[PDB]
Amino acid sequence: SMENFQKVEKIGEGTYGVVYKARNKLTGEVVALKKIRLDTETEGVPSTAIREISLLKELNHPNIVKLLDVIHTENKLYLVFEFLHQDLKKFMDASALTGIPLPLIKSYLFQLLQGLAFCHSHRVLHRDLKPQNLLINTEGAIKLADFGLARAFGVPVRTYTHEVVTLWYRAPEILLGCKYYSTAVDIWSLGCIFAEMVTRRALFPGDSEIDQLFRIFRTLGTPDEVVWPGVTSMPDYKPSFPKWARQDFSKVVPPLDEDGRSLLSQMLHYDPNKRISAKAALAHPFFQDVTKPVPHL
Amino acid sequence: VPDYHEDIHTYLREMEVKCKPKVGYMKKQPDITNSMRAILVDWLVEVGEEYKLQNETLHLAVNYIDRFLSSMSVLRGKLQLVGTAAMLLASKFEEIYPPEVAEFVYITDDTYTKKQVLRMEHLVLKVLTFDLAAPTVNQFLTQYFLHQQPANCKVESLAMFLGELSLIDADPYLKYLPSVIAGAAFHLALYTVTGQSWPESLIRKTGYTLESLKPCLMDLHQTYLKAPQHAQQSIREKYKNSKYHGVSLLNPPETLNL
Numbered sequence: 094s095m096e097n098f099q100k101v102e103k104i105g106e107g108t109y110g111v112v113y114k115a116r117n118k119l120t121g122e123v124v125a126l127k128k129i130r131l132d133t134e135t136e137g138v139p140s141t142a143i144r145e146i147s148l149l150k151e152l153n154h155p156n157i158v159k160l161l162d163v164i165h166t167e168n169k170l171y172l173v174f175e176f177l178h179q180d181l182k183k184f185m186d187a188s189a190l191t192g193i194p195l196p197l198i199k200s201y202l203f204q205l206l207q208g209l210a211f212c213h214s215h216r217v218l219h220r221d222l223k224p225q226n227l228l229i230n231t232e233g234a235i236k237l238a239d240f241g242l243a244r245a246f247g248v249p250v251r252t253y254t255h256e257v258v259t260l261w262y263r264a265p266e267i268l269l270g271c272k273y274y275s276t277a278v279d280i281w282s283l284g285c286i287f288a289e290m291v292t293r294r295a296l297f298p299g300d301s302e303i304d305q306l307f308r309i310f311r312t313l314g315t316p317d318e319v320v321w322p323g324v325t326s327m328p329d330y331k332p333s334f335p336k337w338a339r340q341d342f343s344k345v346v347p348p349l350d351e352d353g354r355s356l357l358s359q360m361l362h363y364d365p366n367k368r369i370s371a372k373a374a375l376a377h378p379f380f381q382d383v384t385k386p387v388p389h390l
Numbered sequence: 391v392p393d394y395h396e397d398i399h400t401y402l403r404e405m406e407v408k409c410k411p412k413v414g415y416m417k418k419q420p421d422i423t424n425s426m427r428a429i430l431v432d433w434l435v436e437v438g439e440e441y442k443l444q445n446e447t448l449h450l451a452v453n454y455i456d457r458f459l460s461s462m463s464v465l466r467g468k469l470q471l472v473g474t475a476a477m478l479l480a481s482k483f484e485e486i487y488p489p490e491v492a493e494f495v496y497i498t499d500d501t502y503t504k505k506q507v508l509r510m511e512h513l514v515l516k517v518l519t520f521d522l523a524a525p526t527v528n529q530f531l532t533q534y535f536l537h538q539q540p541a542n543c544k545v546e547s548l549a550m551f552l553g554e555l556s557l558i559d560a561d562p563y564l565k566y567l568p569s570v571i572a573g574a575a576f577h578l579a580l581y582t583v584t585g586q587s588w589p590e591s592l593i594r595k596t597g598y599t600l601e602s603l604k605p606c607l608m609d610l611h612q613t614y615l616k617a618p619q620h621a622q623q624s625i626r627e628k629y630k631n632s633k634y635h636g637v638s639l640l641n642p643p644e645t646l647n648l
């Protein structure tokens with residue numbers, strides 16, 4: 094079953110499994126293999142893999158990582174994906190001295206929003222967008238990956254898992270314990286990632302949920318009933334929250350031009366209902382001139 | 391949040407046809423029958439209660455079973471085993487906290503071993519080729535519910551019941567798609583409680599008309615009227631709980647006048 098695949102090297106570790114680079118000996122194709130151990134005696138096929146596979150087969154799109162094959166054994170389960178060369182996080186760290194050129198930021202953000210709109214249009218939440226899970230190839234593509242935490246949703250949504258999204262990229266409606274959340278939580282993640290491409294450091298590196306809220310508030314202002322009808326009702330809202338003034342957005346991500354600031358500001362709108370959709374984002378004037386440069390690996 | 395409502399509706403409408411079990415499958419099952427399937431499904435409803443599982447989970451499980459049986463011939467002694475694994479898979483896919491495999495082995499009064507349930511799980515995955523994200527009556531209902539003006543959760547709970555009732559009788563409901571059964575369900579609920587009809591807004595959205603729903607509606611209405619006397623009763627019991635405003639305790643209309 095794997096007779097044809099030739100291991101090249103470990104690439105790392107998922108929400109589970111180990112990931113390897115391999116070549117198809119017969120076709121020459123380069124792939125990534127996610128290897129999951131199962132057992133019997135235990136809990137069977139992990140719900141992460143069940144979701145990742147089922148959703149990943151429906152989501153076929155140029156900015157979503159391609160699941161090529163699924164190999165069964167009694168004991169082993171292999172997910173075969175197209176190989177991509179590195180992740181955004183690795184890339185940004187390599188772009189230390191030079192910064193990432195704005196046309197490339199724009200390209201990458203355009204494509205991520207494309208792929209994210211596609212997820213959202215097929216009732217899928219990613220729920221874990223961050224540079225580690227955004228993969229880039231040597232031809233200008235960037236692609237959503239790691240659907241380990243993804244989930245199929247319904248209209249209107251019901252309460253889904255709370256322990257969700259990596260801290261630094263977590264939307265405030267989740268931090269505040271709101272019983273519903275939706276697509277808006279993924280856009281906030283992009284928002285944060287967009288700011289991170291520009292400034293190269295993370296927009297809200299909190300080390301707890303409270304520290305993370307406070308960082309959001311000190312940048313965006315403490316929300317109240319006028320900015321966000323309903324906040325003072327939410328489960329983890331506290332009337333003793335310090336009330337910080339909103340900072341002028343030019344200060345938040347200084348290198349951004351007016352269009353960029355506009356976009357970023359809507360991607361980080363507190364009220365999810367008014368926050369921008371990936372669909373709507375693709376028509377934003379920020380993108381009027383977008384192209385597709387190849388980066389420098 | 392409507393920015394995607396239409397795109398999603400469209401999508402589920404395509405996918406329901408790709409994920410639809412093969413209509414005449416029971417004829418080709420040499421050892422099981424519609425009536426055994428009713429029993430199994432009714433039991434599943436029971437399991438759903440015990441473990442406080444979502445209705446969505448029920449509906450997916452049923453979908454899985456019907457799809458599995460559309461190509462895998464199974465002996466009656468093993469039907470429950472399929473059932474169990476479907477339900478497990480459904481829980482894994484849909485639930486925040488699925489019950490553990492040990493719990494599933496529990497509720498099959500020691501009929502099967504853990505190892506079997508786990509093997510069966512693997513075989514259901516292989517047979518359904520991991521395609522678990524299947525549209526359900528529930529997912530359709532829930533969208534239709536956005537068109538009530540105003541919401542009446544007597545209606546919503548009533549539609550869910552009718553919808554759910556349909557899972558049990560593969561004859562005739564296996565030949566109707568989820569979106570359509572949802573249609574009938576919603577209309578019938580709506581009529582019974584408030585005396586109103588399938589809204590014009592839903593015509594525009596679904597393309598379905600009272601006309602196009604008539605076949606299924608007849609089947610449903612009848613099922614509603616004979617519900618008290620059905621061999622299986624787990625759903626009626628369930629839908630008496632305050633949770634669903636005891637809608638099963640409501641009197642079905644004598645006529646529809648279509």
Ligand SMILES: Cc1ccccc1-c1nc2c(OCC3CCCCC3)nc(N)nc2[nH]1
Pocket residue numbers: 104106107108112124125158174175176177178179180183225226228238239
């Ligand atoms: C992420 C990475 C860094 C350096 C070299 C290769 C890769 C890489 N990971 C890949 C991968 O798995 C990445 C995935 C693994 C689990 C962590 C989240 C991302 N899949 C595919 N198709 N290509 C990959 N390339």
